[PDB]
Write a protein that binds this ligand. Structure first.
Ligand code: ZN
Lengths: 282, 48, 49, 97, 169, 49, 349
């Protein structure tokens, strides 16, 4: 489906452009083409095939979506949906409000929809996802790095490809994969689940996972901390004790107050300085 | 015993690659120096 | 039963050998490997519930 | 450690109990100084050593850490005051450039 | 020296994001194994996250606390408590935009629940992988001129890009 | 040295010894801070050999 | 269907691909590419502009506009402005030259086709490089790029099948990336070689030897420069490694990490000690030879390298090493023994 436009005398454009009818085409202007499409260059009969393909923009993935978010005035839709609020008594009025509150929150508490999309992926400080040596020549880490890795890999690969003006397919496809890696990191399992490529097909503890440790319904979460001046032992009854008192193994007591104690020591001839008492009790 | 279509009956009568634990005179086991025990567990007998 | 798993896990191994196995350069234990079964049982006891 | 003891698992159940009484500080220091607030403890120790009073509780790594996790999840978490003005919990090592 | 009274939670401006990053990870490289070294421009490139040794650069050209916070004109690593390594954040710059799932698999899928898009059908279909929607313009048609933004398929897409062709052996 | 009274058997402590929390069942030595002596410590150390 | 979590199949619609690349076709396309580049060369030259630059252009246009990188690395190339500028230029060039244009044009377009048509050849290969340790996908895509290269680097002029040709490149890009991204830790290739080389042998040994041969055995077995403890270090180095998030024997709520302690940071004890240390130190320091007490400290105590005498001479920007020796002496000496009175740092060691 293309319009054969044979030419002769003057020249045209370059086999790939969108034309409909464009300012000029060929032969010193003796040629234009009210009809749309993209240029194809024949070099024999100085003829030109112009398949019709007006320039439309239909992108995939985020980019696309992202655009939309930007290209959107809330102040608008706001009062817009506001006009479905009661008018269609019960049917379309339901959805309306639903969709509407969102906005209000966005609209109100200053933010920007576009934000929900990504191109700037944060990274935890190292010592929070450390890499440490352990046993006779081996170390350990957090899955993140891994997650993180694969991700980077993908993105950088991607770059080249574009830099390679490659078939938008593999490209798209690539992006596709990338996106995956993306979420894969944020919250693993929310769609298909990746595991240590090798060994235990156990999933990798992702952000969310790690976070709320939701893989337990945040009902059994590992809630609790360890105290410093704590201690434990078995109990016995002290008939001697007076209500507000309680027996305490010196030995145990000792540790719990070491510092204070130390000080006192020093505070008394018996102990010249600190490290003294310190070792002095070791 | 591995044979061949040519009735090639070559029989390497040996393969001790794997060894398995033994049960003590009393009935327990020695795993990596640790006295280990195995608990006989129950289930739903196979039938209709 | 545990003996069987790593056992069956060896046959899997041995069957993957008929593929690139020579006419008769396969006979004995060139088709062999305990590790899989070795682990199974080993893994078993040692790390059994 | 081996020749060194561990700390008591202070949990919600105990938090709850404490709360009930109203010993704000304790619960704080309890979880901060006595546990997750780094700089604190040392400063704490020393203080005690010199026979001094106790400094105040900052943010528990647990939480800071948390913030990061969030951020790592592409999520700004902002500590603010009355005037609704952001506050750095990392006091610097967060502010860049 | 003072106290707080209000905590906030807002999305992150890529700007804000970038407003945090003490650098950008460009390299996967974890640590060099021969010496266990935070691979340069890698995930531990302390040039980004900081000294691994409080108050001290890489090449060591700088050490003592007597260099408060003076960057290295060589290893390009600052001088301060290595502790900051568990606090500073770096980023990655995405060649292409990627969606934050928590606004998709969470229903209403905020974003879609914001574009009259099927919290799945619509949203998913497109973004994730296979199908495309008409971004801004669509004059050409198949009977129906355009969809300000409605969905469309590949063959659909191409049957417009390449118009219509056919090979005959 | 009084802390070596019993663990004198060229590395190990001599059998049949009344040990108490804190004594040395066995003597071991390695290298810390990636075997880098503190400059702070440096000085101190020099002052006594 | 829904959570049709099988990118695989999708990409696998490569059957919708028309691999109908008969020899005659492949051929044709081939030359059409080389020529396309040769052209670019003329161009750049016949223009004084960079070649890569050119083709970069040639692409975009052929690559349609619905594909233009909204962020050409964020403004690198003015995708919407500096672009046409070139076009009208080239277009505004004589036929003889301008002809080369549509050549490269077709040239690139042709390329595209060629690529795709063999995207399956790709896959048919990745299959063999499975398990080695990398997402089939990643595998595919990598071989995919190795392919493109193969394309680039390819002289059709020498009559012979592309399949069999490129097939090579693919492999490389693959292994290439395998050695690269495989591990959690960056390690040399030659490293890899040997590593596998090892493991492999292990079998050929364990089997025969009936037992698990060790260093010695293998070190020997291995070859030219193989020491037991060498072997040793390798294995150690060839390890996976380990997750901190690994659940512990508790099998309930314990994780490796819950046990790894920190040593880089001083316990309030030490912290205090050092601060406490830093104290009396200078306490003594001050009441002493001003510039000469500071000397040693000013050197390593402030930066690095105390007693760099042959330096500290000009580091004092004056006196010679000869005298330095002396100073130290009395300095330290005079101190300690004086501090034998006022006992402070005496409680350290
Ligand atoms: Zn430096």
């Amino acid at each position: 489906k293309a319009r054969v436009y044979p030419f002769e005398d003057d020249v045209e454009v370059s086999t790939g452009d969108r034309v409909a009818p464009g300012d000029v085409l060929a032969d010193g202007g003796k040629v234009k083409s009210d009809v749309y499409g993209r240029v194809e260059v024949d070099l024999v009969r100085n003829v030109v095939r112009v398949v019709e393909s007006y320039d439309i923009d239909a992108r995939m993935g985020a980019e696309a979506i992202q655009q939309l978010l930007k290209e959107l005035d809330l102040e608008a839709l706001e009062k817009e949906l506001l006009e479905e609020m009661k008018h269609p008594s019960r049917a379309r009025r339901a959805k309306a409000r639903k969709r509407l509150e969102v906005v209000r929150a966005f609209l109100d508490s200053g933010n920007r929809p576009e934000w929900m999309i990504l191109e700037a992926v944060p990274v935890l400080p190292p010592d929070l996802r450390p890499m440490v040596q352990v046993d006779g020549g081996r170390f350990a880490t957090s899955d993140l790095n891994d997650l993180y890795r694969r991700l980077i890999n993908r993105n950088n690969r991607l770059k080249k490809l574009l830099a390679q003006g490659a078939p938008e397919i593999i490209i798209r496809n690539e992006k596709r994969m990338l996106q995956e890696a993306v979420d894969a990191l944020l919250d693993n399992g929310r769609r298909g689940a990746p595991v240590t490529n090798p060994g235990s097909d156990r999933p990798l503890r992702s952000l969310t996972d790690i976070l709320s440790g939701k893989q337990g319904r945040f009902r059994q979460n590992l809630l609790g901390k360890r105290v410093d001046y704590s201690g434990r032992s078995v109990i016995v009854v002290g008939p001697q004790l007076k209500l507000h008192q309680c027996g305490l193994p010196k030995r145990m007591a000792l540790e719990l107050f070491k510092p204070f104690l130390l000080k006192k020591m020093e505070e008394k001839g018996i102990a010249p300085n600190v490290k003294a008492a310190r070792r002095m009790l070791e | 015993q591995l044979i061949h279509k040519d009735t090639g009956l070559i029989k390497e009568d040996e393969v001790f690659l794997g060894h398995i634990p033994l049960m003590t005179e009393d009935g327990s086991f020695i795993i990596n120096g640790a006295d280990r025990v195995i608990v006989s567990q129950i289930h739903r007998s196979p039938g209709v | 039963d545990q003996f069987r798993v790593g056992l069956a896990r060896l046959a899997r191994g041995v069957r993957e050998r008929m593929l690139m196995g020579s006419e008769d350069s396969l006979t004995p234990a060139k088709l062999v490997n305990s590790r899989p079964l070795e682990a199974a049982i080993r893994e078993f006891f040692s790390r059994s519930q | 450690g081996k020749a060194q003891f561990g700390g008591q698992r202070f949990g919600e159940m105990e938090v709850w109990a404490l709360e009930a009484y109203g010993a704000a500080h304790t619960l704080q220091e309890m979880l901060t100084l006595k546990s997750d607030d780094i700089e604190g403890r040392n400063a704490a120790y020393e203080a005690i050593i010199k026979g001094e009073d106790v400094p105040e509780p900052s943010v528990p790594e647990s939480f800071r850490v948390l913030v990061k996790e969030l951020q790592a999840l592409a999520l700004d978490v902002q500590t603010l005051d009355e005037k609704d003005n952001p506050v750095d919990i990392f006091e610097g090592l967060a502010s860049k450039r | 020296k003072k106290e707080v009274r209000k905590v906030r939670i807002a999305l992150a401006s890529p700007e804000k994001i970038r407003s945090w990053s003490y650098g950008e990870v460009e390299k996967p490289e974890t640590i060099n194994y021969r010496t266990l070294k935070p691979e340069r421009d890698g995930l531990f490139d302390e040039r980004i996250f900081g000294p691994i040794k409080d108050y001290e650069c890489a090449c060591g050209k700088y050490k003592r606390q007597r260099f408060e916070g003076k960057v290295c004109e060589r290893c390009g690593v600052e001088v301060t408590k290595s502790i900051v390594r568990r606090y500073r954040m770096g980023h990655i710059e995405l060649a292409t935009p990627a969606a934050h799932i928590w606004f998709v698999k969470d229903v209403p899928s905020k974003i879609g629940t914001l574009l009259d898009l099927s919290a799945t059908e619509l949203e998913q279909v497109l973004y994730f992988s296979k199908y495309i929607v008409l971004d801004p313009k669509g004059a050409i048609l198949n009977g129906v001129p355009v969809e300000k933004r409605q969905l469309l398929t590949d063959e659909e897409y191409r049957e417009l890009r390449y118009g219509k062709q056919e090979t005959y052996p | 040295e009084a802390a070596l009274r019993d663990l004198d058997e060229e590395g190990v402590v001599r059998i049949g010894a009344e040990v108490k929390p804190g004594d040395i069942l066995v003597g071991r030595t390695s290298f810390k801070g990636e075997s880098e002596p503190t400059p702070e410590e440096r000085l101190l150390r020099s002052i006594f050999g | 269907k829904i959570s049709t979590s099988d990118p695989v199949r999708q990409y696998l619609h490569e059957i919708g691909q028309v691999p109908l690349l008969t020899l005659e076709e492949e051929v044709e396309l081939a030359r059409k590419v080389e020529e396309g580049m040769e052209a670019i060369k003329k161009l750049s030259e016949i223009t004084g502009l960079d070649p890569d630059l050119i083709r970069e252009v040639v692409r975009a246009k052929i690559l349609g506009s619905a594909r233009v990188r909204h962020i050409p690395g964020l403004k690198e190339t003015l995708d919407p402005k500096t672009v046409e500028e070139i076009d009208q230029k080239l277009k505004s060039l004589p036929k003889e030259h301008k002809r080369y244009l549509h050549i490269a044009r077709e040239g690139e377009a042709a390329r595209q086709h060629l690529i795709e048509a063999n995207l399956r050849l790709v896959v048919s290969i990745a299959k063999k490089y499975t398990g080695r340790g990398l997402s089939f996908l990643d595998l595919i895509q990598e071989g995919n790029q190795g392919l493109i290269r193969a394309v680039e680097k390819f002289e059709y002029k020498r009559r012979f099948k592309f399949s069999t040709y490129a097939t090579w490149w693919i492999r490389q890009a693959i292994n290439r990336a395998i050695a690269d991204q495989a591990r959690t830790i960056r390690i040399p290739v030659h490293m890899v070689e040997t590593i596998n080389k090892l493991s492999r042998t292990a079998r050929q040994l364990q089997q025969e030897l009936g037992r698990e041969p060790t260093y010695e055995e293998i070190a020997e077995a291995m070859g030219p420069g193989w020491d037991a403890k060498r072997v040793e270090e390798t294995l150690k180095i060839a390890q996976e490694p380990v997750s901190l998030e690994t659940p512990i024997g508790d099998e309930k709520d314990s994780f490796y990490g819950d046990f790894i302690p920190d040593e880089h940071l001083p316990s309030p004890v030490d912290a205090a000690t050092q601060s406490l240390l830093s104290e009396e130190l200078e306490k003594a320091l001050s009441k002493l030879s001003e510039r000469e007490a500071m000397v040693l400290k000013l050197r390593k105590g402030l930066i690095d390298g105390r007693e760099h005498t042959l330096e500290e001479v000009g580091a004092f920007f004056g006196v010679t090493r000869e005298r330095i020796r002396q100073i130290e002496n009395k300095a330290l000496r005079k101190l300690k023994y004086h501090e034998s009175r006022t006992r402070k740092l005496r409680d350290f060691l």
